[PDB]
PDB file of C-alpha atoms in Angstrom:
ATOM      1  CA  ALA A   1       8.966  80.742 226.715  1.00 41.66           C
ATOM      2  CA  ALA A   2       7.870  78.194 229.295  1.00 44.58           C
ATOM      3  CA  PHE A   3       7.564  74.615 228.110  1.00 42.93           C
ATOM      4  CA  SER A   4       4.580  74.181 230.421  1.00 44.66           C
ATOM      5  CA  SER A   5       2.169  75.806 232.859  1.00 42.98           C
ATOM      6  CA  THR A   6       3.331  76.938 236.352  1.00 43.99           C
ATOM      7  CA  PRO A   7       5.290  74.100 238.048  1.00 40.63           C
ATOM      8  CA  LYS A   8       5.447  73.092 241.724  1.00 40.15           C
TER       9      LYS A   8
ATOM     10  CA  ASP B   1     -18.908  80.169 216.098  1.00 46.59           C
ATOM     11  CA  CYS B   2     -21.956  81.214 218.127  1.00 49.44           C
ATOM     12  CA  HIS B   3     -20.127  80.897 221.483  1.00 50.55           C
ATOM     13  CA  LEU B   4     -17.319  83.185 220.294  1.00 52.27           C
ATOM     14  CA  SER B   5     -19.716  85.712 218.736  1.00 49.83           C
ATOM     15  CA  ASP B   6     -21.645  85.861 221.981  1.00 49.41           C
ATOM     16  CA  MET B   7     -18.437  86.303 223.977  1.00 52.55           C
ATOM     17  CA  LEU B   8     -17.349  89.031 221.573  1.00 54.48           C
ATOM     18  CA  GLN B   9     -20.626  90.936 222.017  1.00 56.28           C
ATOM     19  CA  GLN B  10     -20.444  90.510 225.820  1.00 55.25           C
ATOM     20  CA  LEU B  11     -16.838  91.733 226.058  1.00 54.36           C
ATOM     21  CA  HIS B  12     -17.344  94.583 223.546  1.00 54.30           C
ATOM     22  CA  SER B  13     -20.328  95.725 225.557  1.00 52.49           C
ATOM     23  CA  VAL B  14     -18.445  95.647 228.872  1.00 52.01           C
ATOM     24  CA  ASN B  15     -15.348  97.360 227.475  1.00 51.86           C
ATOM     25  CA  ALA B  16     -17.266 100.110 225.671  1.00 53.26           C
ATOM     26  CA  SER B  17     -18.652 100.930 229.151  1.00 55.42           C
ATOM     27  CA  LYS B  18     -15.132 101.935 230.331  1.00 57.30           C
ATOM     28  CA  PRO B  19     -15.575 100.143 233.692  1.00 55.58           C
ATOM     29  CA  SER B  20     -12.371 101.406 235.325  1.00 55.61           C
ATOM     30  CA  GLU B  21     -13.209 105.070 234.698  1.00 57.96           C
ATOM     31  CA  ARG B  22     -16.406 105.090 236.792  1.00 56.76           C
ATOM     32  CA  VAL B  23     -16.341 101.819 241.828  1.00 54.43           C
ATOM     33  CA  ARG B  24     -18.517  98.931 243.026  1.00 54.73           C
ATOM     34  CA  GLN B  25     -16.683  95.875 241.626  1.00 52.53           C
ATOM     35  CA  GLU B  26     -17.746  93.621 244.511  1.00 52.53           C
ATOM     36  CA  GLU B  27     -21.362  94.298 243.538  1.00 49.20           C
ATOM     37  CA  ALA B  28     -20.608  92.549 240.231  1.00 50.13           C
ATOM     38  CA  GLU B  29     -19.718  89.263 241.913  1.00 50.97           C
ATOM     39  CA  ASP B  30     -22.103  86.391 241.197  1.00 49.42           C
ATOM     40  CA  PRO B  31     -20.955  83.334 243.176  1.00 50.15           C
ATOM     41  CA  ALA B  32     -23.357  81.058 241.290  1.00 51.57           C
ATOM     42  CA  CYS B  33     -21.518  81.753 238.014  1.00 52.65           C
ATOM     43  CA  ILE B  34     -18.369  79.856 239.010  1.00 52.10           C
ATOM     44  CA  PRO B  35     -17.348  77.635 236.090  1.00 53.90           C
ATOM     45  CA  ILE B  36     -17.658  73.831 236.045  1.00 53.96           C
ATOM     46  CA  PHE B  37     -14.472  73.278 234.023  1.00 53.50           C
ATOM     47  CA  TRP B  38     -11.162  75.069 233.452  1.00 54.88           C
ATOM     48  CA  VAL B  39      -7.636  74.059 232.474  1.00 51.82           C
ATOM     49  CA  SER B  40      -5.673  73.390 235.630  1.00 53.40           C
ATOM     50  CA  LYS B  41      -2.488  72.327 233.818  1.00 54.05           C
ATOM     51  CA  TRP B  42      -0.832  72.271 230.366  1.00 57.46           C
ATOM     52  CA  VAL B  43       2.305  71.201 228.507  1.00 55.30           C
ATOM     53  CA  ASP B  44       3.177  72.701 225.161  1.00 55.81           C
ATOM     54  CA  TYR B  45       5.188  69.989 223.428  1.00 50.59           C
ATOM     55  CA  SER B  46       4.097  71.271 220.010  1.00 56.82           C
ATOM     56  CA  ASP B  47       7.729  70.933 218.866  1.00 58.03           C
ATOM     57  CA  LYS B  48       7.123  67.170 218.720  1.00 60.20           C
ATOM     58  CA  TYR B  49       3.599  65.961 219.544  1.00 62.56           C
ATOM     59  CA  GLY B  50       1.204  68.700 220.471  1.00 61.51           C
ATOM     60  CA  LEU B  51      -0.399  70.257 223.510  1.00 62.20           C
ATOM     61  CA  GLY B  52      -1.309  68.181 226.567  1.00 61.72           C
ATOM     62  CA  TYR B  53      -3.632  69.540 229.252  1.00 63.80           C
ATOM     63  CA  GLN B  54      -5.477  68.681 232.409  1.00 60.90           C
ATOM     64  CA  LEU B  55      -8.883  70.014 233.382  1.00 61.50           C
ATOM     65  CA  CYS B  56      -9.855  70.842 236.948  1.00 61.27           C
ATOM     66  CA  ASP B  57     -11.645  67.491 237.368  1.00 59.01           C
ATOM     67  CA  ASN B  58      -8.267  65.769 236.766  1.00 56.48           C
ATOM     68  CA  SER B  59      -9.315  64.454 233.347  1.00 57.92           C
ATOM     69  CA  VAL B  60      -6.591  64.966 230.711  1.00 53.73           C
ATOM     70  CA  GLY B  61      -6.378  65.506 226.952  1.00 55.53           C
ATOM     71  CA  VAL B  62      -4.006  66.087 224.061  1.00 55.51           C
ATOM     72  CA  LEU B  63      -4.496  68.147 220.903  1.00 55.57           C
ATOM     73  CA  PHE B  64      -1.936  66.574 218.593  1.00 54.13           C
ATOM     74  CA  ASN B  65      -0.014  68.342 215.820  1.00 52.67           C
ATOM     75  CA  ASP B  66      -2.101  66.380 213.286  1.00 50.80           C
ATOM     76  CA  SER B  67      -5.283  68.040 214.602  1.00 53.29           C
ATOM     77  CA  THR B  68      -6.722  64.927 216.218  1.00 53.34           C
ATOM     78  CA  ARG B  69      -7.643  64.902 219.931  1.00 51.90           C
ATOM     79  CA  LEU B  70      -7.457  62.253 222.620  1.00 50.98           C
ATOM     80  CA  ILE B  71      -9.338  62.680 225.883  1.00 52.89           C
ATOM     81  CA  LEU B  72      -8.989  60.608 229.083  1.00 51.87           C
ATOM     82  CA  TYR B  73     -11.760  60.894 231.693  1.00 51.31           C
ATOM     83  CA  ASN B  74     -10.940  61.235 235.381  1.00 51.27           C
ATOM     84  CA  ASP B  75     -11.857  57.571 235.908  1.00 48.85           C
ATOM     85  CA  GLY B  76      -8.424  57.038 234.366  1.00 49.22           C
ATOM     86  CA  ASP B  77      -9.888  54.549 231.938  1.00 48.75           C
ATOM     87  CA  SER B  78     -12.471  55.906 229.472  1.00 49.78           C
ATOM     88  CA  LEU B  79     -11.168  57.576 226.275  1.00 51.27           C
ATOM     89  CA  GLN B  80     -12.781  59.813 223.678  1.00 53.38           C
ATOM     90  CA  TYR B  81     -11.003  60.224 220.357  1.00 54.60           C
ATOM     91  CA  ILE B  82     -11.797  62.838 217.722  1.00 56.24           C
ATOM     92  CA  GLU B  83     -10.467  62.559 214.155  1.00 54.57           C
ATOM     93  CA  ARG B  84      -9.549  65.688 212.170  1.00 54.87           C
ATOM     94  CA  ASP B  85     -12.872  65.354 210.305  1.00 58.96           C
ATOM     95  CA  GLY B  86     -14.785  65.503 213.589  1.00 59.03           C
ATOM     96  CA  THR B  87     -15.665  61.817 213.780  1.00 59.74           C
ATOM     97  CA  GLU B  88     -15.786  60.819 217.440  1.00 60.24           C
ATOM     98  CA  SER B  89     -15.160  57.395 218.951  1.00 58.28           C
ATOM     99  CA  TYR B  90     -15.381  55.995 222.455  1.00 58.43           C
ATOM    100  CA  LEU B  91     -12.896  53.529 223.856  1.00 55.23           C
ATOM    101  CA  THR B  92     -10.821  52.554 226.867  1.00 53.36           C
ATOM    102  CA  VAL B  93      -7.163  52.294 227.841  1.00 53.41           C
ATOM    103  CA  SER B  94      -8.017  48.574 228.118  1.00 53.09           C
ATOM    104  CA  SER B  95      -9.728  48.122 224.734  1.00 58.30           C
ATOM    105  CA  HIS B  96      -8.514  50.189 221.773  1.00 60.24           C
ATOM    106  CA  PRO B  97      -7.450  49.804 218.109  1.00 60.88           C
ATOM    107  CA  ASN B  98      -3.727  49.206 217.546  1.00 63.13           C
ATOM    108  CA  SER B  99      -3.766  52.443 215.548  1.00 60.47           C
ATOM    109  CA  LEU B 100      -4.393  54.512 218.729  1.00 59.97           C
ATOM    110  CA  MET B 101      -1.621  52.795 220.774  1.00 58.95           C
ATOM    111  CA  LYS B 102       1.056  55.436 220.142  1.00 58.81           C
ATOM    112  CA  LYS B 103      -1.271  58.331 220.940  1.00 61.12           C
ATOM    113  CA  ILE B 104      -2.539  56.633 224.085  1.00 61.99           C
ATOM    114  CA  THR B 105       1.078  56.178 225.140  1.00 59.26           C
ATOM    115  CA  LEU B 106       1.778  59.849 224.500  1.00 57.81           C
ATOM    116  CA  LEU B 107      -1.267  60.854 226.491  1.00 57.83           C
ATOM    117  CA  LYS B 108      -0.038  58.814 229.443  1.00 57.80           C
ATOM    118  CA  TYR B 109       3.399  60.500 229.262  1.00 57.28           C
ATOM    119  CA  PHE B 110       1.687  63.888 229.290  1.00 55.61           C
ATOM    120  CA  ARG B 111      -0.374  62.771 232.283  1.00 56.21           C
ATOM    121  CA  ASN B 112       2.752  61.696 234.159  1.00 54.89           C
ATOM    122  CA  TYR B 113       4.529  64.927 233.450  1.00 54.32           C
ATOM    123  CA  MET B 114       1.598  67.057 234.516  1.00 53.48           C
ATOM    124  CA  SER B 115       0.697  65.100 237.614  1.00 53.75           C
ATOM    125  CA  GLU B 116       4.117  65.175 239.166  1.00 55.97           C
ATOM    126  CA  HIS B 117       5.616  68.515 238.221  1.00 56.95           C
ATOM    127  CA  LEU B 118       2.898  71.158 237.845  1.00 57.36           C
ATOM    128  CA  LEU B 119       0.506  72.901 240.264  1.00 56.07           C
ATOM    129  CA  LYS B 120      -3.247  73.247 239.653  1.00 57.25           C
ATOM    130  CA  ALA B 121      -4.647  76.549 238.506  1.00 57.99           C
ATOM    131  CA  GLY B 122      -7.632  77.196 240.756  1.00 58.10           C
ATOM    132  CA  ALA B 123      -6.587  74.647 243.379  1.00 57.12           C
ATOM    133  CA  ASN B 124      -8.637  76.711 245.863  1.00 56.41           C
ATOM    134  CA  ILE B 125     -11.733  76.840 243.666  1.00 54.95           C
ATOM    135  CA  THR B 126     -14.608  74.434 244.170  1.00 53.58           C
ATOM    136  CA  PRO B 127     -16.097  74.127 240.665  1.00 52.85           C
ATOM    137  CA  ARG B 128     -19.845  74.586 240.078  1.00 52.43           C
ATOM    138  CA  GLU B 129     -21.811  71.353 240.453  1.00 52.04           C
ATOM    139  CA  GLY B 130     -23.103  71.059 236.910  1.00 53.16           C
ATOM    140  CA  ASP B 131     -25.672  68.630 235.580  1.00 55.13           C
ATOM    141  CA  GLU B 132     -26.730  66.452 232.655  1.00 53.60           C
ATOM    142  CA  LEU B 133     -26.392  69.347 230.187  1.00 52.76           C
ATOM    143  CA  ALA B 134     -22.651  69.732 230.874  1.00 52.03           C
ATOM    144  CA  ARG B 135     -20.609  66.803 229.546  1.00 50.81           C
ATOM    145  CA  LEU B 136     -16.778  66.778 229.663  1.00 52.13           C
ATOM    146  CA  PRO B 137     -15.477  69.408 227.211  1.00 53.10           C
ATOM    147  CA  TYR B 138     -12.287  69.149 225.135  1.00 53.77           C
ATOM    148  CA  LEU B 139      -9.734  71.692 223.925  1.00 53.53           C
ATOM    149  CA  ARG B 140     -11.085  73.080 220.672  1.00 52.94           C
ATOM    150  CA  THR B 141      -8.371  75.661 219.949  1.00 53.10           C
ATOM    151  CA  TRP B 142      -5.248  77.098 221.600  1.00 55.32           C
ATOM    152  CA  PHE B 143      -2.366  79.456 220.847  1.00 56.59           C
ATOM    153  CA  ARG B 144       0.263  81.371 222.780  1.00 57.35           C
ATOM    154  CA  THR B 145       1.021  85.062 222.345  1.00 61.59           C
ATOM    155  CA  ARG B 146       3.751  87.341 223.677  1.00 61.44           C
ATOM    156  CA  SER B 147       1.713  87.763 226.879  1.00 61.30           C
ATOM    157  CA  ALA B 148      -0.503  84.711 227.417  1.00 63.48           C
ATOM    158  CA  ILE B 149      -1.691  81.268 226.529  1.00 61.13           C
ATOM    159  CA  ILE B 150      -5.234  81.173 225.146  1.00 58.18           C
ATOM    160  CA  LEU B 151      -7.292  77.987 225.590  1.00 57.24           C
ATOM    161  CA  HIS B 152     -10.711  77.652 223.929  1.00 56.05           C
ATOM    162  CA  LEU B 153     -12.805  74.728 225.203  1.00 55.62           C
ATOM    163  CA  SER B 154     -15.640  72.991 223.344  1.00 56.16           C
ATOM    164  CA  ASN B 155     -18.239  74.268 225.843  1.00 57.03           C
ATOM    165  CA  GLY B 156     -17.437  77.782 224.634  1.00 55.57           C
ATOM    166  CA  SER B 157     -15.328  78.747 227.654  1.00 57.11           C
ATOM    167  CA  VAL B 158     -12.205  80.756 226.867  1.00 56.39           C
ATOM    168  CA  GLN B 159      -9.323  80.678 229.312  1.00 60.24           C
ATOM    169  CA  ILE B 160      -6.370  83.095 229.183  1.00 62.12           C
ATOM    170  CA  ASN B 161      -3.298  82.541 231.396  1.00 61.05           C
ATOM    171  CA  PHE B 162      -0.936  85.519 231.542  1.00 62.79           C
ATOM    172  CA  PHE B 163       2.756  84.646 231.608  1.00 62.41           C
ATOM    173  CA  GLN B 164       4.247  87.586 233.523  1.00 64.12           C
ATOM    174  CA  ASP B 165       2.110  87.825 236.657  1.00 64.26           C
ATOM    175  CA  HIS B 166       0.324  84.435 236.533  1.00 65.60           C
ATOM    176  CA  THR B 167      -3.051  86.175 236.431  1.00 65.36           C
ATOM    177  CA  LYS B 168      -5.792  84.254 234.619  1.00 64.90           C
ATOM    178  CA  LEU B 169      -9.245  84.765 233.092  1.00 67.12           C
ATOM    179  CA  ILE B 170     -11.882  82.122 232.503  1.00 68.89           C
ATOM    180  CA  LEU B 171     -14.697  83.471 230.361  1.00 70.05           C
ATOM    181  CA  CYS B 172     -18.001  81.658 229.906  1.00 69.53           C
ATOM    182  CA  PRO B 173     -20.314  82.919 227.184  1.00 67.70           C
ATOM    183  CA  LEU B 174     -23.153  80.615 228.318  1.00 68.98           C
ATOM    184  CA  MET B 175     -23.224  82.146 231.815  1.00 70.25           C
ATOM    185  CA  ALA B 176     -21.945  85.466 230.384  1.00 70.77           C
ATOM    186  CA  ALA B 177     -19.436  85.527 233.248  1.00 70.13           C
ATOM    187  CA  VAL B 178     -15.750  85.887 233.923  1.00 70.75           C
ATOM    188  CA  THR B 179     -13.619  84.398 236.660  1.00 72.97           C
ATOM    189  CA  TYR B 180     -10.505  86.379 237.419  1.00 75.44           C
ATOM    190  CA  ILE B 181      -7.611  84.797 239.264  1.00 72.49           C
ATOM    191  CA  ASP B 182      -5.184  87.463 240.529  1.00 70.75           C
ATOM    192  CA  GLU B 183      -1.507  87.334 241.502  1.00 70.90           C
ATOM    193  CA  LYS B 184      -2.463  86.410 245.107  1.00 71.00           C
ATOM    194  CA  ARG B 185      -4.389  83.416 243.657  1.00 71.69           C
ATOM    195  CA  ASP B 186      -7.564  84.943 245.009  1.00 73.25           C
ATOM    196  CA  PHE B 187     -10.340  84.398 242.493  1.00 73.89           C
ATOM    197  CA  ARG B 188     -13.644  86.147 241.944  1.00 71.82           C
ATOM    198  CA  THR B 189     -16.454  85.479 239.494  1.00 74.06           C
ATOM    199  CA  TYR B 190     -18.468  88.295 237.946  1.00 72.56           C
ATOM    200  CA  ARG B 191     -21.472  88.625 235.648  1.00 74.57           C
ATOM    201  CA  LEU B 192     -20.212  90.653 232.684  1.00 73.17           C
ATOM    202  CA  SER B 193     -23.392  92.788 232.583  1.00 71.96           C
ATOM    203  CA  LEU B 194     -22.872  93.549 236.289  1.00 71.54           C
ATOM    204  CA  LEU B 195     -19.338  94.680 235.438  1.00 73.80           C
ATOM    205  CA  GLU B 196     -20.933  96.977 232.872  1.00 72.59           C
ATOM    206  CA  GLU B 197     -23.137  98.351 235.665  1.00 72.40           C
ATOM    207  CA  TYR B 198     -20.797  98.665 238.694  1.00 69.62           C
ATOM    208  CA  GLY B 199     -17.416  98.839 236.929  1.00 71.27           C
ATOM    209  CA  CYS B 200     -14.089  97.339 238.006  1.00 69.29           C
ATOM    210  CA  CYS B 201     -10.434  98.146 238.672  1.00 70.45           C
ATOM    211  CA  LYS B 202      -7.840  98.950 236.015  1.00 69.87           C
ATOM    212  CA  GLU B 203      -6.187  95.513 236.038  1.00 70.08           C
ATOM    213  CA  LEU B 204      -9.360  93.569 235.244  1.00 71.92           C
ATOM    214  CA  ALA B 205     -10.337  96.247 232.702  1.00 72.94           C
ATOM    215  CA  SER B 206      -7.018  95.923 230.864  1.00 72.05           C
ATOM    216  CA  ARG B 207      -7.234  92.134 230.871  1.00 73.50           C
ATOM    217  CA  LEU B 208     -10.773  92.258 229.450  1.00 73.30           C
ATOM    218  CA  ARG B 209      -9.564  94.510 226.616  1.00 75.21           C
ATOM    219  CA  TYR B 210      -6.814  91.988 225.868  1.00 76.74           C
ATOM    220  CA  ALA B 211      -9.439  89.232 226.090  1.00 80.26           C
ATOM    221  CA  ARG B 212     -11.597  91.000 223.534  1.00 81.26           C
ATOM    222  CA  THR B 213      -8.588  91.056 221.197  1.00 78.74           C
ATOM    223  CA  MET B 214      -8.015  87.309 221.747  1.00 81.52           C
ATOM    224  CA  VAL B 215     -11.643  86.482 221.002  1.00 82.41           C
ATOM    225  CA  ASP B 216     -11.452  88.525 217.796  1.00 82.97           C
ATOM    226  CA  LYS B 217      -8.428  86.428 216.882  1.00 82.34           C
ATOM    227  CA  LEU B 218     -10.257  83.155 217.624  1.00 80.55           C
ATOM    228  CA  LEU B 219     -13.198  84.328 215.513  1.00 78.65           C
ATOM    229  CA  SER B 220     -10.796  85.460 212.764  1.00 79.59           C
ATOM    230  CA  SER B 221      -8.978  82.186 212.039  1.00 78.23           C
TER     231      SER B 221
END
């Protein structure tokens, strides 16, 4: 359910 | 379809071998099979616009909800646009039809978001050199499942990024190879036939079974 790939 | 059929045969062959039940996994490594391109970043804004992504060379693209694609090269200037019917066009941020303005703007917003906030998958991987036969690929198809996001590139590569443990696969059906990035962010690249021969651990085995299912889905649609 992430909006995006792995963040910093 | 040929890329996906090949990949299906390759994976089916490896999996039928039951590679985790044999171990000489390190013998399957082929360092010259490292991929040229993979997806280092992505943003699923399919609620509104579509899916933005960044490849490991820092080029970026968007697959819009209307099935068109806009691609920005890593020079930060050259654009490639692909209509739904497949018609391609070549342009720049500096010179483009008014009709593309909106989409160009959206692409830049995606670029901003990805550049600032997200880390690069395979930051520690030097990509294969690659030559005149390998032009910049674009995202041909993608979907997300309960367990992963699946990204199918126009050079035939299929990337699968697993949500729970951040493990990733990049499959190339031209090289007949797979790069596996584990939870430590260590990566190894194997020749699939060599994995048939020397076998591999349970984790990689499981992920290659799941991969075979994903490729069957991509072929199915």
